[PDB]
Amino acid sequence: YNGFTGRKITSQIFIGPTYYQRLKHMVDDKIHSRARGPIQILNRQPMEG
DNA sequence: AAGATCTGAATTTACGGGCGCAACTATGCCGGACGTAC
């Protein structure tokens, strides 16, 4: 049944238990942004550190 | 004619390159020589 309108969904859905795994790659560990900050000492360009 | 030379044309080593970026980790350069204290 459609959770919003409560109407029956026309086609019948394949549903059941399944084993799922959460992988270690969270979004908070891979989100970053820069405006300006720690440039290099030699190239005078942005660097990771 | 013969040759030696000799000068342009077939075969062997030898550098030098070898995906975009992300992310994370973990590891790194002494031995004699001279003094001082006990």
TrEMBL record:
Q: In which family does this protein belong, per the annotation?
A: Belongs to the RNA polymerase beta chain family.
Q: Covered range within the whole protein?
A: 1106 to 1154 of 1251
> What this chain does, per the record?
RNA-dependent RNA polymerase that catalyzes the extension of a non-coding RNA (ncRNA) at the 3'-end using the four ribonucleoside triphosphates as substrates. An internal ncRNA sequence near the 3'-end serves as a template in a single-round Pol II-mediated RNA polymerization reaction. May decrease the stability of ncRNAs that repress Pol II-mediated gene transcription.
Q: Which domain of life is it from?
A: Eukaryota
Query: Where would you find this protein in the cell?
Result: Nucleus
Q: Which organism is it from?
A: Sus scrofa
The name under which this protein is listed is DNA-directed RNA polymerase subunit beta
